[PDB]
Design a protein around this ligand. Structure first.
Ligand SMILES: [Zn+2]
Ligand SMILES: [Zn+2]
Length: 229
């Protein structure tokens, strides 16, 4: 049906949304002040297991995520990748570890998470240290396009179905400001977007870290938003 939003996900709950064959997004919320915010991750089937991209933004939500996955898909999450060091990506890693998931991210993300006092995935993805680096991981590619929203942000591509999870380096269409730039590299963000555009020219779906999925237009949209400043 319609992509889940803060206006229709019951409080405390996590939703899944089917994106294509063997690929779902997960959507969770975290109210701060008067505004309820949502956050997206990904789930990708591989053989008879699941690969998780990002936590559901905190321990409580991540427990609910695992329960929703069991209810709706019924296959075990065996590995996860966090796409940068913020709480919407690693908050809940200890829940994943308790559930027997092998948790991964880049070495830089582990370092930044440790410095921030955030939860830290247990394992490093090697050969992701330089912009342009890419590695295969089961049914996905993991690409480090360079600094943008954060110094460490990764994107994840599902080649079989042309789905790009852009994460927080990519803004949703309705967003016209960059939001939280405390860890951002605004100078490098446009070049980082260009690397993503050049690497994944056939992507059919682009999923931002927050908000509605779109297509490749979200990439240039993000650059446009960055240019404001
Ligand atoms: Zn972030
Ligand atoms: Zn984010």
């Amino acid at each position: 049906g319609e992509y889940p939003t803060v206006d229709d996900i019951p409080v405390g709950e996590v939703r899944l949304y089917k994106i294509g064959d063997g690929v779902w997004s997960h959507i969770a919320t975290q109210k701060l002040g008067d505004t309820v915010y949502s956050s997206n991750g990904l789930i990708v089937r591989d053989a008879d297991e699941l690969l998780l991209i990002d936590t559901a933004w905190g321990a409580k939500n991540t427990v609910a995520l695992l329960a929703e996955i069991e209810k709706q898909i019924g296959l075990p999450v065996t590995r996860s990748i966090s796409t940068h060091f913020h709480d919407d990506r690693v908050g809940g890693v200890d829940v994943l570890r308790a559930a027997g998931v092998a948790t991964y991210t880049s070495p830089l993300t582990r370092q930044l998470a440790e410095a921030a006092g955030n939860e830290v995935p247990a394992h490093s993805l090697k050969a992701l240290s330089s912009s342009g680096d890419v590695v295969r991981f089961g049914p996905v590619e993991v690409f480090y396009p360079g600094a943008a929203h954060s110094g460490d942000n990764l994107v994840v591509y599902v080649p079989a179905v042309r789905v790009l999870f852009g994460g927080c380096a990519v803004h949703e269409a309705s967003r016209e400001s960059a939001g939280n730039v405390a860890d951002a590299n605004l100078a490098e963000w446009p070049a980082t977007i260009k690397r993503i555009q050049q690497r994944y020219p056939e992507a059919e779906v682009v999923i931002p870290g927050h908000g509605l999925p779109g297509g490749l237009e979200l990439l240039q949209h993000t650059t446009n938003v960055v240019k404001t400043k």
